[model samples]
Target: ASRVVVNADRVKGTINRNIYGHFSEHLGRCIYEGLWVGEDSPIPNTNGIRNDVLEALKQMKIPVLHWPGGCFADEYHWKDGVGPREKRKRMVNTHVIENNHFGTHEFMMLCELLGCEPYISGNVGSGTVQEMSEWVEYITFDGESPMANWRRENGREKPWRIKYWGVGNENWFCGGNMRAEYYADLYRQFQTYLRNYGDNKLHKIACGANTADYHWTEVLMKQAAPFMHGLSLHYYTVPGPWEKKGPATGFTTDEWWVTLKKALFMDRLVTKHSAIMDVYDPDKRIDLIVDEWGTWYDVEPGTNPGFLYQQNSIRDALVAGATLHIFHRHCDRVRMANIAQLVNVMQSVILTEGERMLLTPTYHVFNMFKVHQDAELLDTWESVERTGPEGELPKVSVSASRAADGKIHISLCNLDFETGASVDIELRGLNGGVSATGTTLTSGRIDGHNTFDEPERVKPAPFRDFKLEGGHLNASLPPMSVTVLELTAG
Candidate 1:
């Protein structure tokens, strides 16, 4: 049996609610039909925002939404999307035709509806610094200014108090082919004029290193630390090589094991990057924002390759749990992270096709682990071992926290492709521990998922497998599952 000791007295860091954030790009249907379907459409909606998608997002309590583009962000012009929908400028999105229907106004309006903060990834690759500075003023400045007046004239009388702003996207690749030194210099220059117009103070972020790019982090932290409030890191777990990402479904048993192994490497990415950041800013003033992360597989059969749409399943759930756990442990430095596109792209939480919307396995993990938001980390003396279908991989992956509501939440994942396990967790620093309800997201098959026709194929279920006796919590964890347990002091 696997043994884990939860010590409430040993507190680590406070988990930022934004660590469970999401992204939206002007790619494919992520914005067009996934989240926006026009107010006059037959689908139920609040304005143009899909009602079903809005309801699901409300449940997760999403903290921040990074918008406009991926590579799209570096090329997105804020003005093209605002003002009269009929009169707005239309341009070609990187992958699809852009109607500019969903713009700055729509995003800020959606954030208001969802009760989350808005993060704008401004264009620094193709646009001028003056354009970037003016865009910020247009969205945030309540005072009289050219951009602010334009915003008022466009219909929104009050300015949206946007806080988080990315100076650029991936400069090393799609953003621009700039070297570390070149990007560092540009970051300082671009960020220098990202003004705080009115009540809004810009939490400017510099485009950071790709995975394991130590020199990129070092150069930015050394040269442009003062100008940037956070650093952005982009990494996606592909089961195979980039040119040929493996199939999203019907993968062999071997691919399942390899995928989790690839995802668990985020621990290394954070550890090494944080170590380098420590050398420059030992006080830990700057936050590391994992703005682009999630599984990216080959395009669904007969679909646009550049659209990056893939199915989510038990495999995606495990990746979400494992990565979020890693982020929690390093919350001191890693404050905010956004999982790729929110819907219909990448490893999305919600997928939509026309009027049909379904929650993915990754979506369930976010809901199950919502209690960990703003919770204080509890010391988990988890001495887990390998016990799966294969003899090599560790069966259990976990992270624990004590919530501000006087409840302790323990999120555990069983990576075994099959074969469930009984984990006996011993509680420490609590005199009388009582049994509590638990929730789980699991399915019979690793490839098990929800289709539009089978919307309820995979969802959270009340788990009664956990039992409390003495001071121990006997949690029955299923294979390829994400289980979140809540405990209270008796």
Candidate 2:
């Protein structure tokens, strides 16, 4: 049996709730049909945001959301999206025609509906410092200013207090294709004008590195660390080369192991980047915001190539669980992270088609792990044997946290493709009648996923394959499954 020990007395820092954040870009159906169905449409909506998607995100307790673009933010002009819908300027997106209908107001309204904090990515690649400065004033400044007055003219009397502000998206490539030194200088310039208006102090996040760009992190920290509150990083798990990012479904067992291995790479990336940040800011004042991350695959067959729509499977759930465990372990500097695209895009939690919607397996993992939001991380030790093609990957991954109510929440991911494992969990610090309840997300096959026709094919189900024996918790973890167990002391 795999030996798992949880020491409650050993506590790490509090896991910021924002680490469970999400990203929603204005690409393809992500904004058009996936999130917004005009008020005049047949689909039910509140204002213009779809009701079903809104409700599902609320259930997940999404703490923070990134907006506008991955590449779209740098090209977006705030003025074109405000004032009137019909008269708004039409612009071409990275893929489709951006109507500018779902602009600043719509996104703020969406955040209001879901009750999640808005982390707006500002334009710097192709926008002026004045433009970004004014956009902040328009959204947050309540006092009488040119931008604030324009905001009032546009129908909003009270200014929305937005705290997180990203200076740019990906300046190293899609954002600007500029060098580290050049972008660092520009970040210092752009962030200076993003002033705090009224009581809304902006948490400025400079555009960080893509994957393993250590030079970018070093240059930004050395040149622009003092000017910003956070730095951004982007990583996507693709099993194959960028030209052909393997299929989302119908993959072989080898691909499953490869995907999980790629997902585990997040730990290395975080460790290296955080070490670089420690050199500059030893106090850990600046946060390392992984604003964009998740699995990326080729678009579904016969779909719009640029739409980035892909099916999520049990493999994706394993990826999500493992990656989140990395974040929980490095919660000190890795304060916030937003999964790629929130809906109908890459690694989306929710997928929408017309009036129908279905939760992906990744969504179930998020819901199951939501109890760890703002909870204190507990030290956990696992003696599970490594199992892979050459025994390169651990058979099981685990992270534990203690919530404010004193309940211990443990999340486990069994990464084995076809073998289940029994774990003997030893609760080292607590001694009382502890009740255990679990929710497991797994499917019969590795590529098992939900389609509109079979939306409920893969979802979370009550797990009772565990018992509190004496002071230990004995549990059976299924192959390729994500399980969360909540233990309460009586």
Candidate 3:
């Protein structure tokens, strides 16, 4: 039997709610049809933002939402997205025509609807430093400035308060082909002007590295550490080579193992990057923000390749659960993370077609894990057996956190493809009676996913295969399942 011991008294740190953040970019239908349907469309919406999608994200308790681009951010000019709808400029975005209908105001409005903070990525590749500085002034400055007056003329009488700001998207490649030293200097120059307006202090986030670019992180930290509040990292899990990313569904166990193995690499990435950061800022003031992450698969058949729309399956759910557990384990430096594209894109939690919509398996994982938002991380040790084809992957993955009300929330994932795990959980530093409730998300098939035709194919169901005896909890976790247990003392 596998064992998980949680010491409730040994609190690590508060899991920043922003770690549960989502990313929405201008690519594909992510911003257009998936999120915005225009105020005059037949689909139900509030100010062109889809109400259904907004409601679903609110349920997930998305703490923060990153906007404008993955590669699109560097080319996006804030001025083009403002002003009258018809007068808003248009440009070819990553090959497709970008209608600036969803700009600064629209994004802030979307945030207001979802009750989540807006994290805007600025343009650095094709934009001037003054342009970025003015954009910040346009959104945050509340005084009698020219940018503030221009904002008033547009429609919003008051400046919106936006905290998280990305200096650029990926200066290493798509953002701009630049060396680490060059980008580091540029980051210092650009972030200098992202000043605070009134009490709305801006949290400037610098683009750190892509995948295993340790030198990039080291250069950014060594040079621009004092200037930035957070540094961004981007990584995606693909089952195959980049040119031939495997299908989202109908995969064998081989692909499953590959995907999970790749996803688990985030642990190493964060560990190494944090170690480089610790050398410079030992106080841990600079946060490691995974602004772009999640699974990237081949686009759906016959779809626009540039659209990046991919289906989410049970395997993707495991990826999300395990990746989030990694973040929880390293929450000390890994403060905030935003999954790639939010809707109708790679590993999207919500999918939409016209007016019809459905929640994906990945969405259910985020919903289940939302309880850990803002909770104190508990020190946990697990002795679980390995379970891949070669007996490589861990059979079970777990993380625990305690809320202010003294309730302990433990999330566990059984990674084995064909066998269940009966695990023993020993809760330390607790006494008296305990009541446990569980919710599990799993499917009979590894490729189980929801289509528009069958929206409820894979979702969370009440799990009760757990018993509390002798002040310890014994749970029978189903094969390839993600389970969350809530324990309250009586």
Candidate 4:
């Protein structure tokens, strides 16, 4: 039996709800047709944002959203995106046409409707320091000021309380093509002027490393840690080469293992980066924000490759579950993480076609694991290695947390793509009446995904595959499944 033990008394850290955050960039149909169908469009919507999408987001209890751009944020000018939809400037975005239909106002409005916090990404690469500073003031300042007065003229009376601000996005690459040292100096200069007016103080997040770029973290932490609240990291799970990110829907066994192998590698990257951070920040005051992460695949055959459209599958869910487990275990430093997108992009939770909509397996994983938001982390047994076609991989990925209500929730992922896992979980430090129940997301095949025609194919179902007796819980995890179990202490 695959054995696992978790101690409720051993509180690792508080899992910030923001760790389950999401990212939204101004690319493809992500902002246009994906989220904003226009209030007047035939589709059902509220205030131009799709009603279905808004309702689905509320269900997930989405904590925060990183907005503006991936590469587009650095090039984005705020002035062009405020006031009058018809008159908003029409600009070309990375070879594509970007009619500033959904701008800063729309993003904050979306956050309001979804009941989530907004993490605005400031443009630093091409934008002037004054430009970045003014954008902050415009969004958060309450008292009379040029930017705040301008915001009122644009139709908003009160300033939106945007607490988290990214000083820049990927300064090492598309952000500015600057070295770590150069970006640190630039970050200090840019962040110095971001004023906090009224009750809204911002958490300044500095642009961090990519992949295993520990040197970038070292330099950024050493140089910019004093002024920054979070250091952002962006890494994508590409099954193959960078040039060819491999397929999305119809993947083989080898690709599946390769993807899981890469997803598990996030642990090592965070550990090494955190170790370097310890040298500079012994008190662990700063955070590691994985602002952009998720599986990336070659765009669907007929779609515009730059749009980054792909189908989400059971494989995507496995990767999401395991990767989140990694974040939960490292909650001490990994305070915030935003999956690459919320809808209609790489590994998107919701996919829409015209007026139709479908939620992916990845969406189901988020729904199941939402219980971990703001919960106290518990220590789990070390991962047990199991050999795959390529190499050794963890057979089961697990993270357990005790919520404020005394409900102990354990999220487990069985990585076997072809076989089931009957795992034994020994619970520690619980009082009485420890009944266990859970929801499992799985399908017969690894490539199983929800299509527009069959959206219900890979949804979560009641999991009765567990037996609890004498403080030992024996849980049956199906092949390629993500399960969330709830334990109530009586």
Candidate 5:
């Protein structure tokens, strides 16, 4: 068994719910059948929003949702999707392999339905600076601008008060792979005009480094840091390089090790990025938004490559647990992050095939780990990590908050599938004594999953074996399990 150690009071800070939020694009059924199928579809819905998906999200309590694009954002026209159904213009979706049926208005409406804040990325790669500015004004301006009037005529009488504005998405590649300096200058130009003409304070976010290309972040930070309130980082976890990723649900132990190794690499990336930002802006004035992240598994069999539709299994759960633990540990600098998607999209927590909706193991992990969102980070550190398989990834993860008020919630996971890890948790510095309650999400293998009818089979359950012994807490994490040990501080 591997011996994992943890400290209870090295708290960094709490996380913004947006750090625990999600993103959705126009790529696949994520928007159409998965989230928005028309308010009157045969499937039970609350105004075209699928009921089953809503219930799952209600449980997940997703904080914010960035919508309408990943690559699609640059090609979108905000004015085309609103108004009476007949007046809404149709456009060819150049990036994703689908027609642009759902547009901006649909995105805001989706947020309202899900009870989440909307984060819209601007179309900068091909769109005009004026267009980006007007889009912000249109959504946020309450005063007497033509754009505000257009918004009222379009049906939404008041502004949506959308806060986080992404100047562009993936500008280094799909967002236009210009030189880092080139994107920086263009970003500064866009930021000049991207204003929230309405009452809501706009939180402008400039796209930052793509997976620890510190040069890119350095350039953006040196240039755009003064203009924007936040900068973004995009990191994805795949078994191999992005050029050839392995399947989502079908993988061997070696592949699992490879995937986790890459996911854990983000730990170093964040540390380095935060270090750079600390140098450029020591006061930490700008926030770091991990705008796009999550396990990028190979697409499900028979699914379109561009749709990015994939499976969410036990491996995915462990992946979420580990990544979130990184966010919690670095909560002071990493203020926000968005899991790749929310519904039947790539690396999603929820999936829908017809009226039935399945809550993947990833969903269970996020739901269980939700306790760390927006809470005070009770700093915890361990001296050393327990060893796993010879070739397995490091057993690096995190725990937060010495729970008081009759509850202790620590989100943890075992990255090794072939080896169980023994973790010693010392809940020190608490005002009183500490006792724990437990919950966990575990499956037989990384590919272990649950269908809509079998959701309960893959949900978090009371972990009976993890109990406090003496003043220290000991827990046995099964191979590939995400266990949340809740303890009460007396």
Candidate 6:
């Protein structure tokens, strides 16, 4: 029989909103139709950004947004994107989709508009030290360097305090195809001079190991960790490899197996990386920012092949919920994880078609679990996790915290796909009892989703069905559902 087990709270690190950090690139509709249209498009916008899309992201209160390039970042030249729109030069996007519409100015603008901090990636692959330094100077320098003068002549007079800067994007292939040792040396050299032109120093991040490459992480942590504040790792959960990437929805049981296997790997991968960091910086001075994560699948038909635009379905929500639940569990170490692209792309939280924007199943899950964004984590653990053919993916995942007024919030997810799992959340050690209310994100089938025409198809309904008896709170989480229960002191 499946049951809930408790372990003493494991609390250490604060969940940085930077983890809610999202990615947007020049590939596909992710840039043009998805987030940018310039100051000229017919869609109601602020300086070209789709207002409807902005409004939706505003609701989620996204903490951080990673921009400009994914692979494109390594080759990105700041000068190419600055100055007048008509005058800016467009380069061929060798990696993904390319319209070159969403450039630097628009990127920072979108971040500012959504109240999200931007994580800018500087090119170190084929670009130069001058390019990286000038990029920072262009965006952040307040004085009279050529880059600063360029920024003023082009538009903005002052600078914004941009703290996070990636030394290189994806060094494995798209970045430069360099070995870890070489990349570490190159990273040290690049970061060495990046600070020359700017007053406010940047939080330099070195490109980290790809999924399952602990050796790469070991080298980078040993070599570059001394100079870097953060190191990034990219983990994408696609059921199949690049060639066989299945559809976002309409996936078969086997495909679900593939996706789950990748998702579960994150637990091991994180543990290994955390272990390595523990040795280097025992106080955990270095942060493990899983900057790029989420379900990566085949792009929708007729969509730009390189764009990575995919439909958001209940399956994607499970991916989002499960990954988030994992992050909550490992929040002590895993501080930053972004949900791929935020809109009109792979596993996006929101999908847009002109002025009509709708929340994807993934978006709803974020809304439901937003309570854990930065709250003091409450430690609750269960012994057995739900296992599929690939193995056990935890059945019950939870993070709890007391609100300012002494109300307790327990955020939980039930991983069972075909059956509801009942859980007794032990509150005996939780100080006092609570009168609880619950809200959930769930659907009848794994393939279900909300379309633009029927936006509310899967929004959160007011939940008042939690039961509290004695000191134990009993709640039933539907199969494949995420629940958040709010408890008030009685």
Best by lDDT: 3
Question: Rank order by lDDT, top first?
Answer: 3, 2, 4, 1, 5, 6
Cα deviation of 489 in candidate 6 (Å)? 2.1
Kindly list the per-residue Cα lDDT of model 5 for residues 1-490, writing each as its tens digit. Answer: 3333444555556666677888888767878898777767988877667887888787788888887658878777776666676767765555444444466677787788778888888888888999988888888887888888988887788887777888888888988877888988898898888765645888888888888699998988887789989988998887876777888877877787777778888999999999999999899999999989998877888887877889888878888888887887677788888998877777898888888888888888778887776766775546445444664455646567533343557777877676667777665655677666788788875688887667666777778666687466777877778888766666
Q: Write the per-residue lDDT of candidate 3 for residues 126-191, one digit (tens) a residue.
A: 999999999989998889998999899999998899889999899889889999999988988988
CA error at residue 24 for candidate 4, angstroms: 0.7
Q: Estimate candidate 5's alpha-carbon lDDT, on a 0 to 1 scale.
A: 0.78
Instruction: Kindly report which residue stretches of model 5 are placed more than 4 angstroms away from their true locations once superposed.
Output: 1-10, 92-101, 241-243, 388-392, 402-406
| TM-score of every model versus the real structure | 0.97, 0.98, 0.98, 0.98, 0.93, 0.93
Residue-level lDDT of model 2, residues 258-299, one tens digit each, is 888998998999999999999999999999999989999999
Clashes of each: 1, 0, 0, 0, 11, 6
Model 6: weakest 10-residue lDDT segment is 1-10
Q: Give the true-structure RMSD of model 1.
A: 1.5
lDDT (C-alpha, whole model) for all candidates? 0.87, 0.89, 0.90, 0.88, 0.78, 0.75
For model 3, state the Cα shift of residue 415 in Å: 0.4
Please say which candidate is ahead in TM-score: 2 or 6.
2
- Residue 167 lDDT in model 5? 89
C-alpha RMSD of each candidate structure in angstroms: 1.5, 1.3, 1.2, 1.4, 2.4, 2.5
Better-scoring candidate (lDDT), 3 or 6: 3
- Residue 266 of model 3, lDDT score: 92
How many clashing pairs in candidate 5? 11
Q: Which residue pairs collide, candidate 2?
A: none
True lDDT of residue 385, candidate 6? 52
- Residue 342: error of model 2 in Å? 0.9
What is candidate 4's lDDT per residue for 297-351, written digit by digit as tens?
A: 9988898888888999999999999888889878888999999887889999999
- Deviation from native of the Cα of residue 145 in model 2, angstroms: 2.2
Task: Determine which window of 10 residues in candidate 5 has minimal summed lDDT.
Answer: 1-10
Name model 3 segments beyond 4 Å from true: 92-95
